[PDB]
Specification:
Length: 499
C-alpha cells in the first residue's frame, strides 16, 4: 500500500500546539474567544503572518467562507449545489493558486475542528478538510503536524462515523497525491459531491464501438491509471503503456490528448468551466482510443487480449477513414462502408434503402456520399451477395488493414512555409518507422521524417505548432490543434525505439 506521510511513532513528536504557538499571528488576533480552537465569530486578522497585506485580507475572508459553509443549511446542497459549494470554491481557488495561503487554510480548519461543541458543525469542518486535502497539500512546514492531527483523529475514540470516514479519506487522498503529483484545477461540483459523501467519482468513458464504460475514480486518479483500469476491465493487455491505448477528452467532437499524469477530475473541472463560459451546448465525452502503435506483441501474450484491442482499433480506423481530414476517397469509403452494411444488416432490401438517408450518415457512408453517390453506394451494397457476416467482416478488415494510414498515430496539420514542397494541409502519420508526411488529397506518403533527427531534450514546440527537423537540417513548423498529442507521440515513439 501507499507510504505513510507520518509513522504512528512520530505522531507524538508533531503537536499542532507547538506549531501554532510558534507561527500564529497572536498579537493581531487578540480577542475574547480562544484563538487556537473553534469560534463562532470572525477572526480579526489572519491566523498566520503574511507580509502581503492582500493575503492577510483574503485569509480573513476565507475564514468567513469557512463559517458560512459550516453554518449552511443541508437543503441548499440539494436545491442549489452551485450556491452550496460557492464558499468552498472560493477557498480552494485561493489556496490552489497561492501557495502561501495553503497553511493558513489548513490551520483554520484544524482550529474550527478543535473543541467544536456541535456535532453537525464538526462534520462540516471535516468535509472542508477533505475538500482541501483533495485539492492541495499543506506545505512542508505544516504537513507533519497536520498528518499527526489526522491520524490521531482516525485512531482515537470519539468523532462520529462521519468525521472518522472523512479523516480517513483525507489522509488517504493526501497519500494518493503524494504518489500522483499535484493537480491543476479546483474540484467541480460533481467531484465535491462525491468527496463530501466519502465516495468515488463515477465517470463514463466511451469506447470506439460507441459502448459506454463506467469507472469509479478519486481526485488523484491519472489518465494512466484509468487507461490501465479500462484495459484490464475490457480484458485487453493490462498495461496501457504496452497496448498503446489512452483516454482522451472530446468537446463537441474536438479531441484533445490527456497526458499520462494528468488527473481525470481536472478534466471534469474544465467541462464545468466551459459550461459556465458558454452559459447544453456542451457535448463532452471521455473516449478510450488507441494512441500508440508498438510492434511489441508476444511477449507471448494471449491472442485473445490482442484481439479485443484490434477490434476496438478497427472501429477507430474506420471512423478516421470517414473523416475528410484523413481520407477523401469516396470509392474507398464506399467499399468499407458497404461491407459494414452487409455485415450489420445483411442483404439489401428496398426497406433498407429507404432507411439509409440520414440514418446511415457516419455509419455506412459520409454525408458527401449520401448526396453525390448514394446510387453508387446502394449499388456496391447490392453487389455483396449473399455475403455472410463472416466474409463481409473479413473483407472490410482487409481493406482497413491495407490503407496507408493503418497502424499509425494520426495528426491533422498545416504549414505556412514558402520553401517546403508539401501541400499546406497534410497529415502526420507516426509509427515505429518514422514521422510520415501524408497527403490526404492524393492518399500518398510524401516523406518519412526520422526520429533520429529530432532534438532529444529540446524538441521545439509552442501553443500551436511543433517544429520538426528534416534530413537537410531545415525545419517543418507543423501547426496542429492538438500540440500535446504530437509532442508526446514523438517522445513516446522515440523512447520505445530507444529501449
Ligand atoms: Cl510570528
Ligand atoms: Cl505572505
Amino acid at each position: 500500500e501507499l507510504p505513510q506521510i507520518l509513522n504512528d511513532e512520530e505522531i507524538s513528536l508533531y503537536s499542532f500546539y507547538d506549531y501554532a504557538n510558534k507561527n500564529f499571528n497572536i498579537e493581531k488576533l487578540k480577542q475574547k474567544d480562544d484563538i487556537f480552537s473553534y469560534q463562532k465569530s470572525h477572526i480579526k486578522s489572519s491566523l498566520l503572518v503574511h507580509s502581503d497585506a492582500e493575503q492577510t485580507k483574503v485569509a480573513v475572508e476565507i475564514f468567513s467562507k469557512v463559517l458560512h459553509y459550516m453554518n449552511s443549511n443541508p437543503l441548499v446542497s440539494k436545491k442549489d449545489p452551485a450556491d452550496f459549494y460557492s464558499p468552498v470554491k472560493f477557498i480552494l481557488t485561493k489556496g490552489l493558486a497561492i501557495e502561501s495561503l495553503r497553511d493558513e487554510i489548513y490551520c483554520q480548519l484544524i482550529k474550527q475542528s478543535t473543541s467544536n461543541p456541535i456535532q453537525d458543525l464538526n462534520i462540516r469542518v471535516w468535509e472542508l478538510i477533505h475538500f482541501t486535502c483533495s485539492t492541495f497539500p499543506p506545505t512542508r512546514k505544516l504537513i507533519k503536524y497536520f498528518a499527526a492531527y489526522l491520524k490521531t483523529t482516525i485512531q482515537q475514540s470519539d468523532v462520529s462515523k462521519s468525521v472518522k470516514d472523512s479523516a480517513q479519506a483525507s489522509y488517504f487522498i493526501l497519500q494518493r497525491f503524494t504518489l500522483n503529483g499535484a493537480r491543476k484545477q479546483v474540484p467541480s461540483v460533481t467531484e465535491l459531491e462525491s468527496i463530501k459523501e466519502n465516495r468515488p467519482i463515477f465517470v463514463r468513458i466511451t469506447a470506439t464501438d460507441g459502448s459506454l464504460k463506467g469507472l469509479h475514480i478519486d481526485s488523484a486518479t491519472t489518465c494512466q491509471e484509468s487507461s490501465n483500469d479500462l484495459s484490464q476491465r475490457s480484458r485487453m493487455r493490462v498495461n496501457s503503456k504496452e497496448n498503446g491505448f489512452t483516454i482522451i477528452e472530446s468537446f463537441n467532437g474536438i479531441e484533445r490528448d490527456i497526458a499520462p499524469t494528468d488527473k481525470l477530475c481536472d478534466v471534469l473541472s474544465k467541462v464545468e468551466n466551459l459550461q459556465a463560459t458558454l452559459s447544453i451546448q456542451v457535448n463532452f465525452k471521455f473516449v478510450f482510443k488507441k494512441k500508440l502503435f508498438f510492434d511489441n506483441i508476444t511477449n507471448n501474450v494471449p491472442t485473445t487480449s490482442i484481439n479485443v484491442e484490434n477490434e476496438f482499433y478497427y472501429h477507430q480506423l474506420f471512423n478516421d477513414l470517414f473523416n475528410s481530414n484523413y481520407c477523401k476517397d469516396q470509392d474507398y469509403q464506399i467499399s468499407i462502408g458497404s461491407l459494414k452494411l452487409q455485415f450489420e444488416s445483411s442483404d439489401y432490401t428496398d426497406e433498407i434503402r429507404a432507411w439509409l438517408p440520414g440514418n446511415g450518415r457516419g455509419k455506412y457512408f459520409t454525408t458527401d456520399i449520401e448526396k453525390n453517390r448514394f446510387d453508387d453506394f446502394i449499388n456496391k451494397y447490392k453487389s455483396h451477395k449473399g455475403l455472410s457476416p463472416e466474409d463481409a467482416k473479413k473483407q472490410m478488415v482487409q481493406l482497413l488493414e491495407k490503407h496507408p494510414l493503418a497502424n499509425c498515430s494520426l495528426v491533422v496539420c498545416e504549414h505556412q512555409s514558402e520553401s517546403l514542397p508539401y501541400p499546406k494541409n497534410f497529415v502526420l502519420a507516426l509509427n515505429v518507422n518514422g514521422i510520415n508526411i501524408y497527403d490526404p488529397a492524393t492518399s500518398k506518403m510524401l516523406e518519412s521524417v526520422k526520429y533520429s533527427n529530432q532534438s532529444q531534450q529540446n524538441l521545439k514546440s509552442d501553443d500551436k505548432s511543433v517544429s520538426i527537423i528534416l534530413e537537410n537540417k531545415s525545419t517543418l513548423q507543423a501547426f496542429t490543434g492538438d500540440v500535446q498529442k504530437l509532442v508526446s507521440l514523438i517522445k513516446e515513439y522515440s523512447l520505445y525505439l530507444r529501449n
